Design a binder for this molecule. Sequence first.
Ligand SMILES: [Mg+2]
Ligand SMILES: [Mg+2]
Ligand SMILES: [Mg+2]
Ligand SMILES: [Mg+2]
Length: 112
Amino acid sequence: TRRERLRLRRDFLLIFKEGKSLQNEYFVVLFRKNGLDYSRLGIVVKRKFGKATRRNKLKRWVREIFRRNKGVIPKGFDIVVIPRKKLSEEFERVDFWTVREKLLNLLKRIEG
RNA sequence: GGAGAGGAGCAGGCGGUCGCGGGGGCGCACACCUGCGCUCCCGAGGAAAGUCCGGACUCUGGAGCGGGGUGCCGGGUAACGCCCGGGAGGGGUGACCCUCGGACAGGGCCAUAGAGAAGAAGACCGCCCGGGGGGAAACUUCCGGGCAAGGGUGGAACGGUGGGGUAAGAGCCCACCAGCGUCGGGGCAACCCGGCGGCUUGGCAACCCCCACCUGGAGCAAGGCCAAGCAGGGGGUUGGGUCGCUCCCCUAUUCCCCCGGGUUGGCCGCUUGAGGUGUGCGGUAACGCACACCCCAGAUUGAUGACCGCCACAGAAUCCGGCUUAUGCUCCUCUCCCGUG
RNA sequence: GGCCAGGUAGCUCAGGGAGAGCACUGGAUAUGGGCACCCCCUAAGUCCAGGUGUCGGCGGUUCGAUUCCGCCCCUGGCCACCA
Ligand SMILES: [Mg+2]
Ligand SMILES: [Mg+2]
Ligand SMILES: [Mg+2]
Ligand SMILES: [Mg+2]
């Protein structure tokens, strides 16, 4: 859903500068009110996370978590998900349910 | 069965619940441009990779030189540093694998060790002859002369080993060998086979070089178009005109250089191509030709996931040909070895 | 996707027969300290002695390669339109 896909080239700077942030050991989540009746997701994966296979797997998991849990995630925010060094350190050791739990714990705390 | 060499294919599938990317069809709104909404088709790789070669395709005004690349020979190909076949040299019992022009065109470099390393250089331990001296002798000593043959030195010592011949010795002579020169035969050829002959005189060109062949340079962020927006200023014996050098066609601010500020939108390029698959024919093969069938990702923060059930390596970004590296199986050949019918 | 750089003692940097600087380990000795000397402790310093390496890895050429020729690994940077 590309209507659900927020542009990062223009908006990342604005969200970084004007928005809020939440984090845990695996993710940093940046967010800002978008003035819409729905939320939009963006993913920023640092080059150092790895090659296409690895980065694309992470992005797919993130997109899926967001899509399936859209109903419970707060509405009216532009959201940027950023994986942390730790995650890229035990990514192969971290299962899907753990990534889901850790990401949702942050997403559900987006206020207000 | 064991050990090993060459090579071909596949990339866990099939049946379920949700979620994407591009086409098509449809539902509709269309006073235009177009704007959404919901089924059929297709949707990462053998390496998509590293960017090591070769193209195609774009933009830079000409030509020459330099520079760079390839390196036995013959094909194949759009082309290549690739592929196929063949020739020499080497390794392995063997199937097989690896190597590749020229050092009497020239210049330069060979440390250390060693008597001597490029004109033929050299006498270290030595071998033999002719005298003078000492000494009973063995032996020592001095001068004159002859050896590259043994040993030592090396990565290599100016042909190799055996016999004859030498005072002692040398291709001095002869044998087989290696090299070179020729004559003759077979190959398109690289080269091979046979005969004759003095006696022959380092290595490195992944150093410059010589010979033969090929070759501008950038690169899809190439380049073309639309929309949007701010703000200009300082320079040019001229400089710049898609690497350098040399001659040459230009152009004078609108061009180029520096500082500063505006976008950090959308469309084209963007996928049908030296393209796959299936036969038939030619060719040792690589591959070519003929006919038939097919449409096989085109994203632009960048599309393939999660749950269930019987059994790796890693993700296209302009597209192809090949190389190299990363990696899980399965099958087909042939070689040697133990053991049996 | 493409195009360039660079990888040397721990760190910064030189350059076809492996070095400087900071630095570390010792010995010397207070004008520091146990008290005041004797005796002894500690070395910021100052003397001196050195300690030391797959040349980013793995092959090839060469009798020898930091230098030459291949590939692989790691670390940085550059690109688009407007005027
Ligand atoms: Mg059996
Ligand atoms: Mg690539
Ligand atoms: Mg000799
Ligand atoms: Mg440009």
